[PDB]
Symmetry: D2
Subunit: 347 residues, 4 copies
């Protein structure tokens, strides 16, 4: 069954050369399932890990990818509630200690001892990958793993973000970057949660996707000179909560100025060396909160996958081969990425 | 009874010359009480209004002061629940429309039609001042107005701040600037609310005051080279919620780095041209919220004055004459202001 | 313009004889608008006030009706933000003191000095009725007052209820009584807010209405022997939050047993002499909250009318004449009332 | 080291004869620590389990006790973050699946697969007891296990209760039963959390203990004919949140009538066959919530033990021998139990 080797996209140096090579099969640990990753979404976090954009250092050599979805071909001796052949998902947060004050409060992502799939752990860009059994996702039997894969890191993330904005049904939510991997899922989640979804994006075929997936008001950031004025006029005073899934520091800076008094500006995107320089006078006078949202926890994964299972969200995926993966980064560095890309580990 | 003129500190131009002059008695409007301001605290907001540090423009000529406490010598024809001779307080937020979506949610301070005592309305640096009857403070009979006056804008403010940090009893709260007008009241409120109060301040006689009023750990910002390291070591991982009552943009910038994961950094101080340039990567990874807190609303005023009436808080006040007021600004611009100053309108 | 008399349904004794008689025009007070009530919904609260089912005593003689919707033909001298000819709504809570600790926290309905339209104040079953100007509803210009009228007391009520259940999008909400005046609006609001709406009702043509307005799972209380088992099987463990808009004490009693652990059982209906006898062991073991929800406040009115203005909710109204009103009570006492009834004051 | 047998209080039938007998040493499972229980508090839950007062059936034969505190003399092969000789605590909730939707949200106590120490698992009334390694309490090194033991089930319980009442600092909290095992710890926690603690209890030496531990207003339930009137007069309108740690159904019934509008009535005590028959009219009109609170979770255990470690709480313990345990039940059935009793496993 479980082979001796496999294929995988591995790079031995930051910003180096991606190698679609042959790598050994990862033996599962005492509590880590061995999942035959069928499909795996490509997240911009993988591009950041390749470029080395973040202060934390990656593990080298690295096989990226933190949105794996596959079958449990193997399991460690100590795993509790899993069966071989079941569907499971390798999220960004591979595992935690489950014993510090962060994992006790449900904030498992903010843990000092967190294994990050594809950053400090062999990710999901490989045929077989290992992932903890208490943190992996309980993908229901019968789903289409290709469609599920983008939900595992871009779905739970924007779900947790919109839950962190402290919005109510009917409150304007302005997805800043609402045509990308997270922007489109953010729009679908915010539409399913009852909010009124404004969107801010630009490029070729961004407005078409945004309108199709169920947005309300789209504001082109490459054709509107004053974005703040446009959002203040469209939302009648500002968005009640902004989600910054963009990769532009200027977008984040302009995001704290079109949110209402008593609003909330969730920071989800983490561009390279970006600082949210919000004016203190305007932030205090308007009581604007600027929350930061990291990947969702286990309850958030359950609720996001439950939104998916109901058919409310559907990430627009381009399924390609694994070998094409380097070009995707180029297509993602230029910004020409619409929706999400998923890689099939088979090819 | 109500005279024809009075004395007041009035300035006709931003950063101009403060004039302890004779000014007419303000006739109350249809719903505004006429309060004989007995004492009035001096808030740093008055210094900012004098310097013109804020983008919004003041009304000129202006008599500053938004912490007035006095007796209701007169009342408009339409006031509902007030009696002549009762004790009342002129807060910063003079009045609101009580009809927009901000006043309906209790966020009366964030209202487009808000009268700001001492900024867009003749403040409390005068013998008799007028203030709305639904927004003024219900100062209980028997209190000492001299001690109450600093509670009216510096007490409700830090009470609302600590309530905005979403702290629990036992959670470390790091008052950044915990020896000034708001810092000392913030320390007393955070101590009465159950939090463990760390303090960050420096100068002559700041640590003595901080220890006396009930602080736990004091970190001298003029003798600790690495404040972030000191707070991370003292709080064991960071403060669970920071209150930025300081007037240093550098303090605000360093305040987003010693707050725990899932923390909260309430911005209360509004220095001149200050920007909270928090790192986006470190904010998103740690889920750090950066809330801004403006003056408290009517419920917050009630609860802050109720903390005062129990004797839990006591602002260290230096009661001086009104004529001394200009020098106070100097003593406040240099930073040598410890605790709070209150002016007696009589002299 | 404003006439000398008018027609109105007035009863001089509890459970007495309803008299469609001629009554004088109510002169507006200093702050109370005089609204020419065009249409007025008939709420079961009016039936309870007629029967005397509640411990509090009504004012006699009384013209009931607390869901009035009309034009502002007159206004008191002290009203602030109203224009003659504008659309306004007489809600259940006519007015408050706006000065106690309940009105300061936004809980204006829980006020010791609350005027209740149609209970302690001449209600909206009359051509012209008076209602406070800070508490009345800001009905947008262009709406259809006939359709708006049921939203004014049955819409804001169930909106506040579903907001009190502390639900999340995707959480099962079980409207117990989901075909009546409040049940149908509760179903539409819970569907617009993202929840998954289960419904419990029975009779002739209740399931048809429930399916039409957008319910998910309907459980017939006159054809299911074990309602608790049915809800536990349909919701997979119980409803995440129940709304008790029914008028059966048995329904309320059975409502605390099919709500999940960590659930919430909002009590909205107030039957005559009803007691929610929930088992203490089962409530403590499952951490079940039993919240009670009274009419919504001004923010809740704004958000409920904003849900209506978007076209998300639509109360199924039977518009009849005012003279028919007594028979409605019969049609409401027998339980044959489907949706809502509205009376046109003209006829 | 670990012996072959031990002594323990074991009963083979509900309400039968307690046998201080010799029982074998429990071998730890794969993930369960073996704790040499030094001391163990006696909770009224143990009396209920002996009497069979609850619908759920106990495991027979049973050694009760769910407040064990001891040293980790042994550990299973799969335990993660424990060392032999460390201090640990056997709480009521022995362990959970950590995989259902309740354990994911932190509500581990509400789990269908929950091991209850001393109810479905050999409790802490024995020299050596086994308890899961992810759920046991991290008792800091240096504490006095005798004093800690009552915190493990009566401390975390009332801490979670007072956190469930949604109180603010300064809000009156009325501990109903504020001289018993939970009442005294509830008073100390509510005093440390900032609330104003009213107390309701009666008997010999209850008021003395309540005054000593830091209560504010004591209301004798055996000398006040009208408890509701007394609490409404003392709290000025009612308690802002009630904690029902009593064992009287009448106390629970009267507890929903002296809580303010928008209050909260946490149900902590679970008397035999008790029903909280709260009036629906009075509950809906006043928006009174009736929350039920079960044992606290891991975060709640951490925060309660952290309140203890600061020296803020101190359960008044009578340390006795294990053999005396049956008489304690008598002393607890008659109601003559003041504070808490702890048993030393050595004797
Ligand atoms: N916080 C988390 O838990 C988490 C998880 C995964 C990814 N991320 C981060 O999210 C970011 C975005 O990921 P993605 O998959 O959406 O990337 P993407 O490149 O697929 O999409 C980025 C989007 O931003 C839009 N955009 C670019 N400039 C803009 C501007 N000035 N204003 C508005 N929109 C603008 C683009 O048009 C595109 O729609 C990355 O930094 C990624 O690492 C966060
Ligand atoms: N947000 C509101 O509702 C509200 C209301 C009133 C005032 N304010 C603002 O609060 C600010 C402070 O007011 P105040 O009365 O406390 O002023 P103050 O001058 O009396 O006290 C300022 C304090 O900051 C300390 N400080 C200075 N530099 C510091 C640094 N680098 N790090 C830490 N602490 C430092 C000083 O030593 C002093 O203790 C002003 O900008 C004022 O306008 C806010
Ligand atoms: N709390 C508030 O703010 C507020 C405001 C207005 C009205 N109310 C109260 O709401 C209650 C209901 O009002 P309404 O207009 O919906 O009344 P209604 O008579 O129009 O509708 C009652 C509904 O209850 C259903 N029902 C009857 N027995 C049932 C049972 N055993 N199980 C489930 N459903 C059952 C009926 O079939 C019907 O669908 C009244 O007591 C009213 O006074 C509350
Ligand atoms: N919910 C939970 O997580 C949890 C955990 C442990 C125990 N409990 C339950 O808590 C209850 C109480 O436990 P305990 O250790 O405090 O019991 P206890 O017998 O030690 O103390 C009971 C207290 O109730 C007081 N009391 C009696 N009648 C009263 C009345 N009419 N009004 C007010 N006070 C009255 C007594 O005087 C005494 O102070 C038990 O039912 C127990 O099983 C709950
Ligand atoms: Zn990602
Ligand atoms: Zn951890
Ligand atoms: Zn101020
Ligand atoms: Zn306003
Ligand atoms: Zn009604
Ligand atoms: Zn009131
Ligand atoms: Zn117990
Ligand atoms: Zn579980």
């Amino acid at each position: 069954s479980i082979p001796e080797t496999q294929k995988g996209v591995i790079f031995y140096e930051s910003h180096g050369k991606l190698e679609y090579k042959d790598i050994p099969v990862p033996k599962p640990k005492a509590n880590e399932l061995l999942i035959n990753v069928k499909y795996s979404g490509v997240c911009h976090t993988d591009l950041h890990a390749w470029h080395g954009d973040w202060p934390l250092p990656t593990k080298l050599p690295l096989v990226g990818g933190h949105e794996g979805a596959g079958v449990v071909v193997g399991m460690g001796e100590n795993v509790k509630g899993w069966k071989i052949g079941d569907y499971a998902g390798i999220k960004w947060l591979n595992g935690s200690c489950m014993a510090c004050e962060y994992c006790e409060l449900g904030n498992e992502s903010n843990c000092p001892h967190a294994d990050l799939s594809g950053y400090t752990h062999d990710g999901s860009f490989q045929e077989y990958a290992t992932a903890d059994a208490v943190q992996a996702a309980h993908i229901p039997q019968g789903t289409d793993l290709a469609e599920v894969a983008p939900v595992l890191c871009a779905g739970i993330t924007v779900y947790k973000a919109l839950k962190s904005a402290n919005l109510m049904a009917g409150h304007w939510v302005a997805i800043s970057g609402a045509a990308g991997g997270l922007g489109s899922l953010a729009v679908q989640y915010a539409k399913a949660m009852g909010y009124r979804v404004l969107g801010i994006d630009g490029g070729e075929g961004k407005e078409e996707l945004f309108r199709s997936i169920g947005g309300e008001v789209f504001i082109d950031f490459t054709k509107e000179k004053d974005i703040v004025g446009a959002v203040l006029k469209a939302t009648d005073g500002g968005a009640h909560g902004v989600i910054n899934v963009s990769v532009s520091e200027a977008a984040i800076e302009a995001s704290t100025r079109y949110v209402r008094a008593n609003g909330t500006t969730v920071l989800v995107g983490m561009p390279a060396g970006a600082k949210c320089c919000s004016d203190v006078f305007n932030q205090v006078v308007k009581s604007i909160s600027i929350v930061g949202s990291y990947v969702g926890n286990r309850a958030d994964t359950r609720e996001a996958l439950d939104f998916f299972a109901r058919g409310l969200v559907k990430s627009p995926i381009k399924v390609v081969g694994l070998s094409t993966l380097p070009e995707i980064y180029e297509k993602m560095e230029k910004g020409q990425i619409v929706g999400r890309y998923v890689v099939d580990t088979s090819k």
